[PDB]
Amino acid sequence: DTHILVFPFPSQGAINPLLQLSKRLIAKGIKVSLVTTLHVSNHLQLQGAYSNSVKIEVISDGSEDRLETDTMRQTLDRFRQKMTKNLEDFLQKAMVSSNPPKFILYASTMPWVLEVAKEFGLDRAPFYTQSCALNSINYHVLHGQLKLPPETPTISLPSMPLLRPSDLPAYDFDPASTDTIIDLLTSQYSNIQDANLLFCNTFDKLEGEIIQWMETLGRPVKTVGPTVPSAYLDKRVENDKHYGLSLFKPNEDVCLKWLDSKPSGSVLYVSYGSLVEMGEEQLKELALGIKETGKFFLWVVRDTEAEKLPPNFVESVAEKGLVVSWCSQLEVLAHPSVGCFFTHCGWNSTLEALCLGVPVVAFPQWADQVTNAKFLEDVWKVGKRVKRNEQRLASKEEVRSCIWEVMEGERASEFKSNSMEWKKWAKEAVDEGGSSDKNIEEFVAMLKQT
């Protein structure tokens, strides 16, 4: 049996991509052990009931958890120190077992794992879960060719589209941690000389030239994305309709029946992000702008954010809008009545829109969302970004006009045609013989040779 370890960043918001990749690997005959923390094992249902199910290895005792008194630097230092010892202790045992691991695939945000693997003589590779465009930006910040505030009005990197400073990732949302955040991201490219491979959560037709640029750094690059459940793509992995490893228990849904009565391609699905907080002022303009379009809309917004909606808003859109606390985003985007997706452009949501063929109204808020939005509008051409003013407020007029332009304007047919092409190309990449399937097959072949 060929056995490997997968070690994602141990957070709910960061583990889905390699859980999905793990499922593609076990479908090809690889035995996978998920290395993780007590916290993740307690909050997620990771155990499958089958012979080839991902094996869960909890290697921590919770002492690596953040304390309320920490600066981000202190939390990161304690995590690295304790998890370095935890991984060393785990490999001490695993490397002398009956079927020792032959490789460790780890999140790119834990670059310290490479030095542990190096000491043990264990093959290893980081997984970059975000876009390949972010790899180029972060690499250029590490090597001095770019700065956190761009020193120039325009940015022309190699094999990339032109970027304005507003298109660059915004991580100054927490000004005391900005320096720590940039050091961690730039540290993901520092030790790649010793990586067996570099894995990226993207596909060749989506970021081909950037991937080719990344291949000039000296190491083989394997695109294995999009990491979206097989049911919404190639359908080659039996009932894989969710991101997790345990059996899928669907929630009671009020969204699909409502969508069933609406005309095909007519409704705007709205989500500004499951963990994004929006100010009352901005939420009011967003709400009224959607209302002014007169379109049917399905807005998913969590209970603590829903309390910030204007009074009488929900009652005022009783006819055209369904505002709910939760829906299955994949099932909503796959529904034929959904014709546009108002999104914050998180990388997960970006790939879901591309895989499901839905045009977008882009409303990025922080981090890599701004760069993803730039690509959705200006490179992939599946939608438009909401214009904000000199105070960064997107007005209700700016929200309404953007929605109308994507769904009804001169380029509306272009966006739908482009969305349909990307859906076809994303499915092709992960289906048999595709660019991502080939890379996965190549990895599995390499593992079979040890």
Ligand X SMILES: CC(=O)N[C@H]1[C@@H](OP(=O)(O)OP(=O)(O)OC[C@H]2O[C@@H](n3ccc(=O)[nH]c3=O)[C@H](O)[C@@H]2O)O[C@H](CO)[C@@H](O)[C@@H]1O
Residue 367 engages ligand X in binding (rule: CB under 6 A): yes
Inter-axis angle of helices 412-430 and 204-215, to 10 degrees? Answer: 60
Instruction: Tell me phi and psi for residue 347, to 5 degrees.
Output: -60, -40
* Residue from the set 188, 293, 348, 401 that interacts with ligand X by CB under 6 A: 348
Residue type at position 176: A
Residue 368 engages ligand X in binding (rule: CB under 6 A): yes
Residue 326 engages ligand X in binding (rule: CB under 6 A): yes
Tokens found for residue 260: 């069933």
Residue 347 engages ligand X in binding (rule: CB under 6 A): yes
Q: Which residue is nearest to ligand X (CB)?
A: 346
Name the CA dihedral angle for 25, 31, 33, 34, rounded to a multiple of 10 degrees. 20
Decide whether 253 or 292 has the Cβ nearer to ligand X: 253
d(CA 285, CA 396): 4
Q: What is the closest distance, in whole angstroms, from the C-beta atom of residue 282 to ligand X in the complex?
A: 15
Whether residue 147 contacts residue 141, with contact meaning beta carbons closer than 8 Å, is answered with: yes
Decide whether 91 or 333 has the Cβ nearer to ligand X: 333
Residue 6 engages ligand X in binding (rule: CB under 6 A): no
* Residue from the set 11, 13, 254, 397 that interacts with ligand X by CB under 6 A: 13
What DSSP string describes 27-67? HTT-EEEEEE-HHHHHHS----SSTTSPEEEE---STTSPP
Whether residue 386 contacts residue 398, with contact meaning beta carbons closer than 8 Å, is answered with: yes
Decide whether 2 or 129 has the Cβ nearer to ligand X: 129
Q: Which stretch binds ligand X (CB under 6 A): 172-180, 216-224, 361-369, 410-418?
A: 361-369
Which residues are CB-contacts of 257 (< 8 A; sequence separation ≥ 6)? Answer: none
Q: What is the closest distance, in whole angstroms, from the C-beta atom of residue 324 to ligand X in the complex?
A: 8
Tally of CB atoms within 10 A around 205: 16
d(CA 113, CA 80): 9
x/- mask, ligand X, residues 242-281, rule CB under 6 A, reads: -----------------------------x-xxxx-----
- Which residue, among 341, 378, 336, has the nearest Cα to 358 in the 3D structure? 341
Decide whether 19 or 367 has the Cβ nearer to ligand X: 367
Size, binding site for ligand X by CB under 6 A: 21
* Residue from the set 337, 349, 371, 436 that interacts with ligand X by CB under 6 A: 349
C-alpha count within 13 angstroms, C-beta hemisphere, residue 400: 13
Residue 369 engages ligand X in binding (rule: CB under 6 A): yes
Q: What is the closest distance, in whole angstroms, from the C-beta atom of residue 354 to ligand X in the complex?
A: 12
What DSSP string describes 287-316? HHHHHHHT--EEEE--HHHHTTSPTTHHHH
- Which residue, among 106, 99, 98, has the nearest Cα to 123 in the 3D structure? 106
Q: What is the closest distance, in whole angstroms, from the C-beta atom of residue 53 to ligand X in the complex?
A: 21
Q: Which stretch binds ligand X (CB under 6 A): 54-62, 140-148, 347-355, 430-438?
A: 347-355
Chain centre distance of CA 92: 33
* Residue from the set 329, 371, 401, 419 that interacts with ligand X by CB under 6 A: 329
Q: What is the closest distance, in whole angstroms, from the C-beta atom of residue 446 to ligand X in the complex?
A: 27
Whether residue 337 contacts residue 262, with contact meaning beta carbons closer than 8 Å, is answered with: yes
d(CA 95, CA 32): 15
Q: Which stretch binds ligand X (CB under 6 A): 40-48, 365-373, 406-414, 421-429?
A: 365-373
Among residue numbers 71 through 110, which ones bind ligand X (CB under 6 A)?
A: none
Q: What is the closest distance, in whole angstroms, from the C-beta atom of residue 367 to ligand X in the complex?
A: 4
Q: What is the closest distance, in whole angstroms, from the C-beta atom of residue 283 to ligand X in the complex?
A: 16
Among residue numbers 284 through 303, which ones bind ligand X (CB under 6 A)?
A: 300
Q: What is the closest distance, in whole angstroms, from the C-beta atom of residue 74 to ligand X in the complex?
A: 23
Q: What is the closest distance, in whole angstroms, from the C-beta atom of residue 267 to ligand X in the complex?
A: 15
| Residue ranges in contact with ligand X by CB under 6 A | 13, 271, 273-276, 300, 326-330, 344, 346-349, 352, 367-369
